[PDB]
Amino acid sequence: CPSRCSCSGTEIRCNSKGLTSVPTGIPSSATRLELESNKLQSLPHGVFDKLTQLTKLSLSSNGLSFKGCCSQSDFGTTSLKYLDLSFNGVITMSSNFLGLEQLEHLDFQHSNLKQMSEFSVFLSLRNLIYLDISHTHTRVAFNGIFNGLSSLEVLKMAGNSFQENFLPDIFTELRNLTFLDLSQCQLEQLSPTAFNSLSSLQVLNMSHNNFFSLDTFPYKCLNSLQVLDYSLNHIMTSKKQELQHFPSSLAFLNLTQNDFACTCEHQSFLQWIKDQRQLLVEVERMECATPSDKQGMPVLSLNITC
Template identity: 30%
Template sequence: MMGPVLAACLLIILSTAWISQANGATCKKDGGVCTCNDQTKNVDCSSKGLTAIPSNIPTDTDRLELDYNKLSSLPSKAFHGLQSLTYLSLSYNELQTLPAGVFDELKNLETLWLEQNQLQTLPVGVFDHLVNLDKLYLRQNQLKSLPQGIFDHLTKLTILWLSYNELQRLPEGAFDFLEKLKMLQLTNNPWDCSCRDILYLSNWIREKKGTVSNIEAAECDGGTKAVLEITEEEAAEDCVYPNTTTAIPTTIITTLASSNDDDIPELPVPQENFQKFLGYQEPDHLPTQPQCLMSISGYLGLMMSLVLTSAAILYVIHFLKKA
């Protein structure tokens, strides 16, 4: 009767080993590229030349470091399943945009580093689910504008870095919900102090002066004057920026509507427009060489585990029949 017992134990051991391998393929100890600390739940994937985020990051990870890599884009579900994260660093990469919903499951995140990337815009609502965020670093990007309400849900934020971007203006009420904010960096942006839009920022700085640090250092484009010193007379223009949507003039619509089909010139349509029309979408990212190696290694390990597991099951059945 000891045969079936030993076989059952072997089956349990093999199953445990297979689960461990499947969940830990990211870590160096299992053939991955990242350094993992089981005690602190830290995963360090920084400075690995990664062009895509490694798969199978342990779901109980508390701190994930992906800085100093070559990430130029992120899949929308890059961090899904990582609800335990409190710290995420994506600084010093080549990110040009962020997909909508990429941070939606990170409700426990407290620190988010996005410094030194190539971000030009942010999707509407990209930070809405980060209700416990304390620090947000967006310094040294190429942000030209911010969506309305982009920070409205970050009511626990104490530190916000927006310096060294290309911001000329802020949407009305951009900081109104940041009641716990203690530090805000706004320097080295080309703030357009000739437009009426700047009055919101000027009045906000004047109101928060002494309670939020660093805000007085914000200067108008060219460094001619501090933003908080701008008056209504100086910011008298109602400016329209290039990224503002404007209506098509009715004269153009009338002309197009009255034209004969033979008079309408044939315009070339880029190939990518046909692809979009047909529903084609580029994949979120292509696997990197380390990921391919990890995938092959994981596949071979899985096959070996299945073979051994099957053998153990047959062994149990054999002894149960004998009994």
């Protein structure tokens, strides 16, 4: 077993050891390798060339930058199923996962991704089930960003942003999605058809965007949806005057910490909000932001009159 590592079968873990270099003598038989929470600032060229049996690799939480990710030439193996490069430096995409088509789990969270959003870099990853590109300084504009991800079930993309603060139809190929995190993306508007193909979606996180309205129409097709998180937006009205119901599958609607406008101008919307009581969570944290004389009051404890 390499120095400062723990070995079990073909698995090697060398985590939180303050390592500045990759341990020497890692055997070619290794199938899983974790070097997480260390101080690796660079990897010598072809350091992984002998690790041809690797199915799992995590380099999470180091100071690594990749001038050309990601390919079998970068990691030696062509049988990688799990790659975690989260909490690192700059990751530039020069190769579209050449030789890494077996990937099932991919994590880039809190690393600065470059040359990804303008292209369809995931085109070959027909087996990918989990993708995390949260907080990657990604500006979404090109609609084909996720082309190829037919099998995807979990998509986390929190802490990014969209051209024109607009959510386009970027999920149309992702029919197997069960979890979608779009929180903290500065969103203000969405395509009415953005979620129409997502019949298996169970959790949709829209928390801490910049929406001023809430409607039921974009969620009409979401007949597997259980949790809808709209906390921390600026919701005070709806596009449509006549709001319907959310899908019957829905169990939780989070509207806490929205800047509700408790005025006669929004009597109808607020009445509809009251009627969603059985869906709502922590109702004490649903408070009026305006007008001044009602600021801080729980929305459900108010009867607005004109």
